[PDB]
């Protein structure tokens, strides 16, 4: 558990991800390591899904709070999930090399759900089948382009920049819809 | 010759239109013609599926053009044609894709798909000159990026399903309300 954490904190830390690197920063023994991680996949799919569990929590938690309007609320979602989906890009990358044959649509699905809520909450007055359909559109298009933009690595300046023009596309939808 | 192949291709659209049941056999027939006849022009129900792609994608990159280039039609009009007329393709072109897998595992699904992204970024941002002059060229070429990037990763993940005429027209109609209030938003600056 503790030894765990701090395995998978050197994993988090540490394309050239072993095994043998993994355990030489956590200060363990290979065989000791072994004892948890049979190898290198076992460990990435422990990241993958600590990810998804993490990124369900927050993106709830942006949508949920109001010491913002909705809009402040969308603009920072957006900024979570692309930095997000560059962090699932390279465990992905890495499991391709690891578990080369090898549920992110159950995770996708249940974002889908929350953001519909958040949706009734931020249009009151647009009639249920609009508003499921703006619904659709908007997590389909959070979804499909952060994806797209994390086929490549990015810079953090990047990954700023795309976020604020996707908002602004996203946010004007929004808006359009409430006026 | 010509009539004879625009004949077959038109039989193996409407055959699709699903994929799991696509064989040249079934084209045959529509056609009106020997599967013997056939045969000359495709040899197998792979060699069909390339023409309608090649053909599909010609027809595509035709249509972006001479719907962004349309100066008779106000800008906005122009893209929520382009919308329509772009989402409409990928759900006729989800069975074809879908058919090729099965007939051509191996075939390189996504190198040619990326040249035509690419003459399809370079309209957008031509388009956008026109469509919004007083904004700055680096704010102007991310939206267009945003613009090719979401019109074809949306029209894609939407055509992964059947879709009827009035869910396509549906559809088509919020994403383009979609890019529209986007680009509104950018002018108002």
Same mark, same amino acid.
């Given at each position: 558990?503790?030894?765990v954490?701090?395995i *998978?904190?050197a994993?988090?830390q540490?394309?050239?991800? /072993?095994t &043998?690197?993994? &355990?030489?920063?956590?200060g363990?023994?290979?065989?000791?390591?072994?004892?948890?991680?049979?190898?290198?996949?076992?460990?990435?799919?422990?990241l993958?899904? $600590?990810?998804?569990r993490? #990124? #369900?929590r *927050?993106?709830?938690?942006?949508?949920? !709070?109001?010491?913002?309007?909705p809009?402040e609320?969308?603009?920072?979602?957006?900024?979570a999930?692309?930095?997000?989906?560059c962090?699932?890009?390279?465990?992905?990358?890495? *499991?391709? $090399?690891?578990a080369?044959?090898?549920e992110?649509?159950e995770?996708?699905?249940?974002?889908?759900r929350?953001?519909?809520?958040?949706?009734?909450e931020?249009?009151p007055?647009?009639?249920?089948?609009?508003?499921?359909?703006?619904? $659709?559109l908007? #997590? /389909? /298009?959070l979804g499909?382009?952060?994806?797209?933009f994390?086929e490549?690595p990015?810079?953090?300046?990047?990954?700023?920049?795309?976020?604020?023009?996707?908002? !602004?596309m996203?946010?004007?939808?929004l808006?359009?819809?409430?006026?």
């Open positions: 558990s503790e030894l954490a701090s *998978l904190e994993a988090v540490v394309q050239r991800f /072993t &043998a690197r993994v &355990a030489e920063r956590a363990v023994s290979i065989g000791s390591l072994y004892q948890y991680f049979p190898n290198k996949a076992a460990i990435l799919f422990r993958q899904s $600590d990810e998804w993490r #990124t #369900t *927050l993106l709830g938690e942006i949508l949920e !709070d109001t010491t913002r309007p809009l609320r969308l603009r920072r979602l957006v900024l999930f692309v930095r997000s989906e962090e699932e890009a390279a465990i992905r990358v890495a *499991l391709s $090399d690891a080369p044959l090898y992110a649509r995770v996708k699905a249940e974002g889908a929350v953001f519909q809520a958040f949706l009734r931020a249009l007055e647009v009639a249920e089948a609009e508003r499921s359909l703006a619904g $659709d908007l #997590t /389909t /298009t499909a382009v952060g994806k797209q994390s490549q990015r810079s953090e300046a990047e990954i700023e920049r795309y976020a604020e023009a996707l908002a !602004d996203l946010c004007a939808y808006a359009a819809l409430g006026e």
